[PDB]
Amino acid sequence: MENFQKVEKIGEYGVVYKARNKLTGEVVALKKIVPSTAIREISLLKELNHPNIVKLLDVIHTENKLYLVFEFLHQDLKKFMDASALTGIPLPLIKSYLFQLLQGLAFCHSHRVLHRDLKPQNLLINTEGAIKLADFGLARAEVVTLWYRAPEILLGCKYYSTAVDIWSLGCIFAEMVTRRALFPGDSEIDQLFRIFRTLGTPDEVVWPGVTSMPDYKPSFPKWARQDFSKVVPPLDEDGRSLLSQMLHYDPNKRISAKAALAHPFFQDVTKPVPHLRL
Numbered sequence: 001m002e003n004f005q006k007v008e009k010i011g012e013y014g015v016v017y018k019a020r021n022k023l024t025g026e027v028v029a030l031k032k033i034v035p036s037t038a039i040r041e042i043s044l045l046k047e048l049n050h051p052n053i054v055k056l057l058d059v060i061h062t063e064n065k066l067y068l069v070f071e072f073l074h075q076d077l078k079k080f081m082d083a084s085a086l087t088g089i090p091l092p093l094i095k096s097y098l099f100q101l102l103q104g105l106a107f108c109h110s111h112r113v114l115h116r117d118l119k120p121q122n123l124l125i126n127t128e129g130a131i132k133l134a135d136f137g138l139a140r141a142e143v144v145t146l147w148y149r150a151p152e153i154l155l156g157c158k159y160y161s162t163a164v165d166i167w168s169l170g171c172i173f174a175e176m177v178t179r180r181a182l183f184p185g186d187s188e189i190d191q192l193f194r195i196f197r198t199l200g201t202p203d204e205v206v207w208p209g210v211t212s213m214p215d216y217k218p219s220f221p222k223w224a225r226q227d228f229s230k231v232v233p234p235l236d237e238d239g240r241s242l243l244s245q246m247l248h249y250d251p252n253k254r255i256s257a258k259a260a261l262a263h264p265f266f267q268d269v270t271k272p273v274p275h276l277r278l
């Protein structure tokens with residue numbers, strides 16, 4: 001660590017600082033998290049390189065402590081959304097960001113690597129119009145937000161799939177469009193019930209096997225499903241169609257990142273440059 005000079009606290013899996021490499025002069029994001037199985041899993045992530053994945057530069061395991069050195073980006077999506085709350089992020093930019101994130105997920109998923117905790121706070125953007133996934137697969141290696149958690153996780157599924165990331169991204173997509181969180185639960189049951197109140201309480205018809213999930217209770221209230229025209233206006237039909245497929249209850253019916261990239265919604269995708277105030 002003597003090789004790094006902290007500049008400021010970027011945020012809080014451990015604290016993260018903006019730091020400078022005393023030798024190279026490189027500015028990076030330093031995350032202070034040591035078990036062995038962890039060292040191995042982390043080492044694998046160092047090879048998981050993609051333009052839409054925040055690059056893990058180095059893994060420093062010294063003094064029985066673990067430090068992760070990441071490429072540095074100046075802003076996260078949460079901050080950009082708050083900064084664009086009065087006017088809303090332009091649809092072309094929303095589409096560009098969604099498309100890029102799906103490319104990133106398609107890559108990770110093709111390597112059987114899941115993110116597991118996607119949220120606006122770990123989606124980083126730069127002046128070039130790029131957006132990148134941060135904190136990827138470290139979940140396998142303050143109050144935690146439940147807003148983007150897939151229903152199968154909330155219902156006790158222990159061996160969930162890549163589908164959980166598609167669900168989280170769908171929630172973020174809706175949030176960019178409406179400028180309000182889709183399912184802002186403040187407890188596990190509030191989160192589950194908010195989802196049920198919007199998409200309808202799941203049953204064996206739409207989700208075979210749901211009534212046998214660990215935390216499923218026959219006593220769950222039965223709410224009717226709401227129309228997406230009401231959930232995310234003024235998203236057009238292509239966008240609503242895609243969102244509906246990203247929010248399918250059955251993880252096996254939920255659209256994959258690869259298939260989502262071919263959805264008609266992206267027929268006119270472009271790469272606009274955002275207006276960033278750094």
Ligand SMILES: CN(C)C[C@H](O)COc1ccc(Nc2cc(Nc3c(F)cccc3F)ncn2)cc1
Nearest residue numbers: 010016029031070071072073074076079121122134
């Ligand atoms: C309260 N508010 C004023 C603070 C700012 O919004 C904070 O603004 C920010 C937000 C993000 C960055 N850049 C990062 C973060 C990161 N890792 C990383 C992450 F992105 C999320 C969680 C864990 C991580 F390790 N890796 C690389 N570059 C800088 C400044």
